[PDB]
Amino acid sequence: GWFREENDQWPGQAMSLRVEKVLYDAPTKFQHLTIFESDPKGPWGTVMALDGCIQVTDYDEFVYHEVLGHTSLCSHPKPERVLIIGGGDGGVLREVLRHGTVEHCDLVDIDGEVMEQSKQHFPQISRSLADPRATVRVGDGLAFVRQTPDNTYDVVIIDTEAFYKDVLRILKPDGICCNQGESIWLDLELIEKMSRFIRETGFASVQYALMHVPTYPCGSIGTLVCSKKAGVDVTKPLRPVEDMPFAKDLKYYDSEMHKASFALPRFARHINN
Amino acid sequence: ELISGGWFREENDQWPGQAMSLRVEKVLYDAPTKFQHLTIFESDPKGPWGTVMALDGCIQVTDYDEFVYHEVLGHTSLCSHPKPERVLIIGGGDGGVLREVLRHGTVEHCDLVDIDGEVMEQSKQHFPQISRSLADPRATVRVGDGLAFVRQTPDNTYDVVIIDTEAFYKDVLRILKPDGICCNQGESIWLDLELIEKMSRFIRETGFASVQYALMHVPTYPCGSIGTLVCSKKAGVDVTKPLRPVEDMPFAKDLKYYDSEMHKASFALPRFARHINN
Ligand SMILES: C[S@@H](CCCN)C[C@H]1O[C@@H](n2cnc3c(N)ncnc32)[C@H](O)[C@@H]1O
Ligand SMILES: C[S@@H](CCCN)C[C@H]1O[C@@H](n2cnc3c(N)ncnc32)[C@H](O)[C@@H]1O
Numbered sequence: 382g383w384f385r386e387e388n389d390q391w392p393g394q395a396m397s398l399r400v401e402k403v404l405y406d407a408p409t410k411f412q413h414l415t416i417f418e419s420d421p422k423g424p425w426g427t428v429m430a431l432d433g434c435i436q437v438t439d440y441d442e443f444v445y446h447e448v449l450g451h452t453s454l455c456s457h458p459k460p461e462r463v464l465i466i467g468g469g470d471g472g473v474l475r476e477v478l479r480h481g482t483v484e485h486c487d488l489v490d491i492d493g494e495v496m497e498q499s500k501q502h503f504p505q506i507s508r509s510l511a512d513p514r515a516t517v518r519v520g521d522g523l524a525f526v527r528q529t530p531d532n533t534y535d536v537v538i539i540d541t542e543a544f545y546k547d548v549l550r551i552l553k554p555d556g557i558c559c560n561q562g563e564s565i566w567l568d569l570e571l572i573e574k575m576s577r578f579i580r581e582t583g584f585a586s587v588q589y590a591l592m593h594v595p596t597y598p599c600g601s602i603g604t605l606v607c608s609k610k611a612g613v614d615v616t617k618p619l620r621p622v623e624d625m626p627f628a629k630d631l632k633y634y635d636s637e638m639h640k641a642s643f644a645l646p647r648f649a650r651h652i653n654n
Numbered sequence: 655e656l657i658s659g660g661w662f663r664e665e666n667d668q669w670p671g672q673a674m675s676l677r678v679e680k681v682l683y684d685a686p687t688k689f690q691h692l693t694i695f696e697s698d699p700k701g702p703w704g705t706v707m708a709l710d711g712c713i714q715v716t717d718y719d720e721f722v723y724h725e726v727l728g729h730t731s732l733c734s735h736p737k738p739e740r741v742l743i744i745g746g747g748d749g750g751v752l753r754e755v756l757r758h759g760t761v762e763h764c765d766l767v768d769i770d771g772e773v774m775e776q777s778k779q780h781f782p783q784i785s786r787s788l789a790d791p792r793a794t795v796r797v798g799d800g801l802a803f804v805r806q807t808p809d810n811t812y813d814v815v816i817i818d819t820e821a822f823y824k825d826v827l828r829i830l831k832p833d834g835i836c837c838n839q840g841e842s843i844w845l846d847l848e849l850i851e852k853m854s855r856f857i858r859e860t861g862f863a864s865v866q867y868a869l870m871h872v873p874t875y876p877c878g879s880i881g882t883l884v885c886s887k888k889a890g891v892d893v894t895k896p897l898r899p900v901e902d903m904p905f906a907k908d909l910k911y912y913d914s915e916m917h918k919a920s921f922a923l924p925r926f927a928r929h930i931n932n
C-alpha cells in the first residue's frame with residue numbers, strides 16, 4: 382500500500398510513498414510513530430513519520446542534521462557543552478559529536494519510543510545515542526530547561542515565553558541557539574513572528590538559514606540561528622569547518638553553503654533585514 | 655479526460671514508489687497538441703497554487719512559484735552579460751522568461767521560438783501574468799523547432815541564449831557573439847546529478863569557456879529544486895558574481911526571488927554536488 386501525507390492548512394494536495402514493509406506503527410504516550418521501509422527501487426530507504434508528518438528518511442537526513450549541528454557550533458568560539466531538545470533519532474547529536482571541542486552533550490526528548498525505534502531501525506542515525514560524551518534523557522524539554530541553572534550551555538539546538546526566556550537564561554554569554562524553523566513557503570508569518578519574539582525575549586540577534594530537504598513539504602526548511610551575545614554575525618562562519626578534521630565527511634554542509642543559507646528569496650528576505 | 659473535483663496524480667516510471675497529487679477545482683484545458691499532452695486547471699481555491707500547467711503529465715508552471723524559475727533564468731544570464739541587446743529564448747512558450755528579459759532596458763530585441771503554439775495560446779488565456787510579454791513588440795514570437803531555428807541562424811547573432819525546454823550545443827555556441835551567455839533549464843542535483851555532470855563537461859568540450867550550475871528553490875518541482883547551467887562563450891568570465899547587479903536597474907524591487915545575494919548563493923552547492931562547479 383501507500384503512506385499518504387497531507388495537510389488541512391494546505392488542503393488540495395498530497396504526497397505519497399509506497400510502503401514495502403511496515404516496521405512500526407503505534408501510538409506512543411505523546412504522538413503517532415510510524416516507521417516503514419519504502420520502495421527498494423527508490424532512494425528513500427527507511428522512513429519515520431510523526432503524527433503522519435515525515436521527519437526522517439535515510440536519503441536526506443544528512444541535510445537537516447548537518448545544518449543544525451554545524452551552522453550553530455561553527456558560529457560559536459569554542460563550544461564545549463551542548464543541549465539538544467528533542468532530536469531523539471540522534472541525527473543532530475551524531476553531528477554535534479564530530480566536534481572535538483565538545484566535552485559533553487545532553488539530549489532531551491519527550492518521547493522514549495522515538496529513540497528506541499531509532500536504535501532499532503536507523504542504526505546510522507542512532508549510533509550516537511550511546512556515545513560516552515552524551516547523556517540521553519526521556520522528558521519534556523520545557524521542564525528540563527526550567528530546571529536547568531543559568532549559564533550552563535554554550536549551544537542549544539532545538540530539533541522538534543518562559544521557554545524561549547529559559548533558553549536564553551541557560552546559555553553562557555556567547556551562547557548560540559538554533560531550532561527547527563519552519564518553511565518560508567508555508568510558515569513565513571510564523572517565522573517572522575518567532576524571529577521577533579525571540580529577539581524581544583532578549584537574544585541579541587536572530588538570523589534565518591534556509592536549506593534544501595527533498596522529503597519535506599515544499600522541498601526546504603530552515604533554522605533560526607540566534608546569538609545571546611551582541612555584535613555576532615552568525616551568517617559568516619566564526620570558526621570554519623574546513624579547519625576541523627571531519628570536514629570532508631560531510632555530505633551537505635560547508636562554509637560556502639553556510640553563507641549561502643542566509644541569502645533568502647526577495648519575498649522572504651525581510652526575515653533577515 | 656480530467657474532470658473538476660477529481661485529482662491530478664503524477665508519478666514517474668524512473669523513480670517508482672513516490673506519487674504527488676493535486677485536487678482539480680476546474681479544468682481549463684485537457685487535450686493532445688501535435689507535440690504533447692497539455693493540461694491546465696485551477697487547483698484548490700483554498701490552497702496557494704492557483705492555475706497549473708502540465709505537459710505530458712509533468713507540472714511545469716503554477717501561478718504560485720512561477721516567478722522563481724523565470725526570474726532566475728532571465729536575470730542570472732542577463733546580469734552576467736555586459737550589454738545584452740539581442741536575446742533568443744528557446745521553449746518558454748508561456749511567456750515567463752520573456753517577461754523577465756524585457757524588464758531589462760538594454761534588451762533591444764528578443765526572439766522566442768517554442769515548438770508548440772498551443773502552449774502559447776493557452777498561456778494567453780489562462781496565465782495572463784505570465785504571458786503578457788508575448789504580445790510585446792520588442793519580442794518576436796515564432797512557432798518552430800528550436801533545433802531547426804538555431805541551425806538556420808547565422809554566426810554571432812545573439813548576446814544571450816536561454817533554453818527553457820551535440821549539433822545543437824555547437825550551433826548554440828556558433829550563434830552567440832564572442833561575449834555570449836547561454837543558460838538552460840538544468841535538471842535536479844537530487845534526481846540527475848550524473849546528467850548534470852555530463853552536460854556540463856560536454857558543453858565545455860563543445861567549446862564554451864566556462865559553465866557553472868545555479869540551484870533555485872522551486873516547491874512545485876520534483877524534490878523542490880532545479881538548476882540552470884550558466885555558460886560563458888568567452889574565457890576569464892565569472893558568472894557567479896553579477897557582472898551588472900540588478901540593484902542598479904529600475905526594476906530590482908519588482909522581483910520576488912532574484913537579487914544579487916540570491917545570485918551569488920545559487921552557485922554554492924551541497925558538498926555531494928559541488929564537484930559540478932569546483
Ligand atoms: C524526530 S525529531 C525531528 C526529525 C529531525 N531530526 C522531533 C523530536 O522532538 C520531540 N519533541 C516534541 N516535543 C518535545 C518536547 N516538548 N520536549 C522534548 N522533545 C520534544 C519529539 O518527540 C521528536 O522526537
Ligand atoms: C512550458 S516551458 C517549461 C516551464 C518553464 N517556464 C517548456 C516548453 O519547451 C517547449 N519545447 C519543447 N521542445 C522544444 C523544442 N525542440 N523547440 C522549442 N521549444 C520546445 C515546449 O513546447 C514547452 O512549452
Ligand SMILES: O=C(CCS)Nc1ccccc1
Pocket residue numbers: 394566598599600674676703713716873874875
Ligand atoms: O507545493 C507542493 C508541496 C509543498 S509546497 N506540492 C506541489 C504543488 C504543485 C505541484 C507539485 C507539487
Ligand SMILES: O=C(CCS)Nc1ccccc1
Pocket residue numbers: 386396397398435595596597672673844876877878
Ligand atoms: O521525495 C519525494 C519526491 C521527490 S524528491 N517525495 C515524497 C516525500 C515524502 C512523502 C511523499 C513523497
